């Protein structure tokens, strides 16, 4: 199941993020943000990203812009960006 500090769709910085766990049912497509295929892009290869939150799991890590809740590595927000790295 999601971890109780999952990052939910309803979250304020969510709505600003549009973030959504349902990456495939995200702005994605939409935005079509340059640097890989949509359909590649979650936070999984995000720029702003964290495998450095406490209480990581596996398909549920941190966000840089959600340092404490946890987003799924398969889900995506606007502010994706390719990995740096
Ligand atoms: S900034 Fe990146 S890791 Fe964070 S929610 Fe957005 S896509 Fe995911």
């Given at each position: 199941?999601?971890?109780?500090?999952?990052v939910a769709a309803d979250?304020?910085?969510?709505?600003?993020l549009?973030?959504?766990?349902?990456?495939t049912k995200s702005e994605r497509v939409a935005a079509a943000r340059p640097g890989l295929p949509p359909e590649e892009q979650h936070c999984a290869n995000c720029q702003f990203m964290q495998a450095?939150?406490?209480?990581?799991?596996?398909?549920?890590?941190?966000?840089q812009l959600?340092?404490?809740?946890?987003?799924?590595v398969n889900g995506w927000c606007a502010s994706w960006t390719l990995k740096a790295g």
């Open positions: 199941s999601a971890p109780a500090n999952a979250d304020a910085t969510a709505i600003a549009k973030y959504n766990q349902d990456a450095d939150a406490a209480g990581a799991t596996d398909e549920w890590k941190g966000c959600f340092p404490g809740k946890l987003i799924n």
